[PDB]
Write a protein that binds this ligand. Structure first.
Ligand SMILES: [Cl-]
Ligand SMILES: [Zn+2]
Ligand SMILES: [Zn+2]
Lengths: 49, 49, 396
């Protein structure tokens, strides 16, 4: 559901996020956040979030 | 109850690294000719020759 | 200037909007703008100079961008943002101070400090975003040669001047006719005095005129006109014109007669108010002409008749007055005024660091000297420093 090529850890998180995204009772804010939450990979710093 | 705000976290780690077990494999070790081997007193171990 | 203002506005928005618990959607565009500013400023070395006692300061920029990671912002995010914002605010304040303390005769509107000249480069134009403040909007419109104005409450448009003119005088200063006036800030208190109470006037009428040439054109001005000038309605001992001696003034206030307040632009009669007191509107003017008459009362009660004899000595001197207060106005040029703090800020910065007197502004940023000789070069420099001060005020 990411609109910016997002990634998540782990596959179980992906399943949970998809289930929440498809849910009808989910808040619009939560849905948009799932669509927009991003990882940050800093190879120069050797860090990943 | 499942709360998205309480369950969404950012997990941080290193992008990559290689773990080594045999440190001494990184050391090139050679030895002098046995004839020339000396003891703690800087004299040859066997001096009768 | 627009880049400096954009830095200041970005930092102010970051400080106000990046708060604990705020939704990610309340700062998304702000986070984008802040990251753009961080990217633009990263890897640049700035030097705020050492004019006067202002210390020489070196600024380096190596800051990480702000993530978009939590649905509601937490304390860690706010702490990181606060660290970056604090450093950037220090840099911006120092750049503003460095710019405020300089001036140029030829290019007074252009940047003077090295820091702002560097910020005027193309690479920094990316930092630019919404320019919504009054002073920055006026800066941009003026750069585009578009008509625009600053709105002032009690504009400081009249240089301080407390003086008099004696149209009739003697060495003994006992039968005097003339005018006194105080012009201070937005106030003009004028009075016309006749010691003889117009006993020998052509029609028992003495005509007094006060002309004030404003140094800049004021538009859409609201003015309060009051019949009497309370500053010149009590007995005074006044030094002679040359200071040789002193003379005595013992006013008795009479109603001003045939009052006419004329607001002139280009010598043309823009506005005219005849025997009208209270709130009046001057559309657009650069000169004020207050012409009023002292009329000897044709009918006097015995006490009043006792006040004014037919000949000398005159112990009671008939005075008429006028008070004019520009409560608010609009001017195409920057001015000091009661509400704003730009003159105070620039003067305080220049005093606190002992900036030597420059070639443009008067010593100590004396506002009376500045407005008295408000040259185009001084106007340009004053607009520059006032805009920088307004930029600084957003963060300091
Ligand atoms: Cl006021
Ligand atoms: Zn006020
Ligand atoms: Zn005199």
């Amino acid at each position: 559901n990411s609109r910016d090529a997002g990634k998540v850890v782990d596959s179980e998180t992906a399943a949970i996020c998809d289930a929440i995204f498809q849910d009808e009772e989910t808040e619009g804010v939560v849905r948009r956040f799932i669509a927009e939450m991003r990882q940050r990979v800093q190879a120069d710093r050797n860090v990943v979030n | 109850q499942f709360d998205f705000r309480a369950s969404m976290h950012m997990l941080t780690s290193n992008l990559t690294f290689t773990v080594y077990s045999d440190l001494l494999a990184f050391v090139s070790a050679d030895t002098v000719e046995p004839i020339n081997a000396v003891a703690f007193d800087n004299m040859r171990i066997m001096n009768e020759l | 200037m627009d880049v400096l203002y954009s830095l200041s506005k970005t930092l102010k928005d970051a400080r106000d909007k990046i708060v604990e618990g705020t939704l990610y959607s309340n700062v998304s565009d702000l986070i984008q703008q802040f990251n753009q500013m961080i990217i633009t400023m990263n890897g640049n070395e700035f030097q705020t100079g050492g004019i006067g006692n202002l210390p020489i300061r070196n600024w380096n920029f190596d800051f990480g961008l702000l993530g978009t990671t939590l649905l509601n912002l937490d304390a860690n995010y706010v702490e990181t943002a606060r660290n970056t914002i604090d450093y950037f605010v220090d840099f911006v304040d120092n750049v503003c101070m460095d710019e405020m303390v300089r001036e140029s005769q030829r290019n007074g509107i252009a940047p003077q400090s090295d820091s702002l000249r560097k910020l005027s480069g193309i690479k920094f134009k990316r930092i630019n975003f919404d320019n919504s403040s009054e002073y920055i909007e006026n800066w941009n419109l003026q750069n585009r040669r578009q008509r625009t104005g600053f709105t002032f409450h009690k504009p400081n448009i009249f240089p301080y001047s407390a003086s008099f003119t004696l149209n009739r005088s003697q060495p003994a200063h006992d039968n005097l006719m003339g005018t006194m006036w105080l012009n201070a800030g937005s106030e003009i208190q004028v009075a016309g005095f006749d010691y003889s109470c117009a006993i020998n006037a052509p029609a028992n009428i003495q005509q007094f005129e006060h002309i004030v040439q404003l140094r800049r054109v004021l538009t859409t001005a609201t003015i309060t006109l009051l019949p009497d000038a309370e500053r010149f309605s009590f007995p005074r001992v006044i030094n002679s014109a040359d200071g040789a001696t002193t003379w005595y003034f013992n006013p008795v206030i009479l109603r001003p007669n045939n009052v006419e307040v004329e607001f002139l632009l280009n010598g043309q009669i823009i506005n005219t108010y005849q025997a009208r007191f209270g709130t009046i509107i001057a559309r657009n003017f650069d000169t004020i002409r207050l012409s009023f008459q002292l009329m000897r009362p044709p009918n006097m009660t015995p006490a009043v008749a006792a006040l004014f004899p037919n000949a000398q000595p005159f112990e009671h001197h008939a005075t008429v007055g006028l008070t004019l207060r520009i409560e608010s106005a609009v001017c195409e040029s920057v001015l000091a005024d009661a509400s704003k703090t730009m003159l105070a800020n620039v003067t305080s910065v220049r005093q606190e660091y002992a900036i030597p007197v420059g070639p443009v502004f008067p010593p100590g940023m004396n506002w009376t000297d500045l407005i008295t000789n408000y040259s185009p070069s001084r106007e340009d420099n004053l607009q520059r420093v006032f805009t920088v001060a307004s930029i600084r005020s957003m963060l300091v």
